[PDB]
Amino acid sequence: VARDITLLECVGKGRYGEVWRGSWQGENVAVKIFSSRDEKSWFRETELYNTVMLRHENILGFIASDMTSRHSSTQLWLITHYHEMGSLYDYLQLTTLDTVSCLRIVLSIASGLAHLHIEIFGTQGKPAIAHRDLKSKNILVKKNGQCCIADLGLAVMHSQSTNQLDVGNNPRVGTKRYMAPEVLDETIQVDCFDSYKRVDIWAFGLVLWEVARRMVSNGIVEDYKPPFYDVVPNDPSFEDMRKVVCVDQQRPNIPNRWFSDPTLTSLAKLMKECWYQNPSARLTALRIKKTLTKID
Numbered sequence: 590v591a592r593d594i595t596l597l598e599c600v601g602k603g604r605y606g607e608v609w610r611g612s613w614q615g616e617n618v619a620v621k622i623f624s625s626r627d628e629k630s631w632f633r634e635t636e637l638y639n640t641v642m643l644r645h646e647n648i649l650g651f652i653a654s655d656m657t658s659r660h661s662s663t664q665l666w667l668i669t670h671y672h673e674m675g676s677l678y679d680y681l682q683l684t685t686l687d688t689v690s691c692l693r694i695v696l697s698i699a700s701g702l703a704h705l706h707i708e709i710f711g712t713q714g715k716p717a718i719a720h721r722d723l724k725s726k727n728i729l730v731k732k733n734g735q736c737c738i739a740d741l742g743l744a745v746m747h748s749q750s751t752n753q754l755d756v757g758n759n760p761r762v763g764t765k766r767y768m769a770p771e772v773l774d775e776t777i778q779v780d781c782f783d784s785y786k787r788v789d790i791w792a793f794g795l796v797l798w799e800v801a802r803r804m805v806s807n808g809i810v811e812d813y814k815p816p817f818y819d820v821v822p823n824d825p826s827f828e829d830m831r832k833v834v835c836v837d838q839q840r841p842n843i844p845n846r847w848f849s850d851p852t853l854t855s856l857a858k859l860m861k862e863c864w865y866q867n868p869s870a871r872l873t874a875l876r877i878k879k880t881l882t883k884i885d
């Protein structure tokens with residue numbers, strides 16, 4: 590498998606490791622080689638993809654986990670399907686969206702997140718899963734215009750039957766820019782699974798905003814920005830995010846022009862219902878999915 594793939598191009602490098610476009614059996618694949626600082630993320634994703642068999646059209650397509658020893662150290666590989674169009678974060682800067690394309694993006698993210706959050710029953714049914722690092726760089730754009738959620742390294746699992754919560758054991762913390770207020774002020778009830786779903790909805794509202802801005806209406810579109818681009822610096826600190834999200838209770842501004850498009854208006858209301866400081870007032874993934882499905 591791993592000693593079977595031709596690494597062709599590094600498409601990503603960072604504290605997590607590196608991502609490569611590889612050839613495998615005459616087809617493109619994505620190959621993540623994890624950094625040593627991030628081994629636990631590899632164990633977690635291997636668990637979710639292999640043991641839990643996490644699979645959905647809006648979840649990055651798993652192919653294989655592997656380990657390879659070279660140079661007196663062992664590399665941890667995650668091989669998945671390859672998406673030429675890359676991350677939603679990159680995609681959103683290369684094009685504007687029309688209504689159909691916008692809804693397709695946000696509905697597909699919502700369908701992947703709903704798949705994560707909803708437990709499947711029966712003898713080996715998927716636990717409920719909270720993602721905990723949802724963001725546009727963690728979403729790939731597929732050729733058919735739908736998206737898929739990637740990076741399960743921080744996933745948390747719950748099973749109602751046993752009421753067992755599996756928070757894993759990963760020193761990695763989520764992307765500060767997308768952290769819910771109850772994460773930033775350290776009130777989040779870490780032994781309650783719902784807490785982690787609600788954190789996901791907060792980040793989902795922020796992704797929603799990111800995409801909505803790129804939908805054209807009345808020949809108007811907003812430039813691509815990351816959430817809180819205007820009030821925090823690149824690579825924001827905890828205190829940067831706390832002052833904005835908690836101290837000043839700020840949320841991303843709704844452009845006035847959105848109220849001129851029935852789709853953007855529905856989405857504006859949707860994302861604001863993801864941003865309540867009170868975590869339990871936020872919409873659920875399924876409710877978001879259902880609402881996005883009634884829009885046109």
Ligand SMILES: Cc1nc2ccc(-c3ccnc4ccccc34)c(C)c2c(=O)[nH]1
Nearest residue numbers: 608619620621667669671672675739740
């Ligand atoms: C152009 C392009 N860039 C990417 C960057 C990162 C990841 C990527 C993101 C998150 N977990 C992964 C795990 C294993 C392998 C890849 C990933 C992907 C899939 C892609 C992709 O498919 N296409």
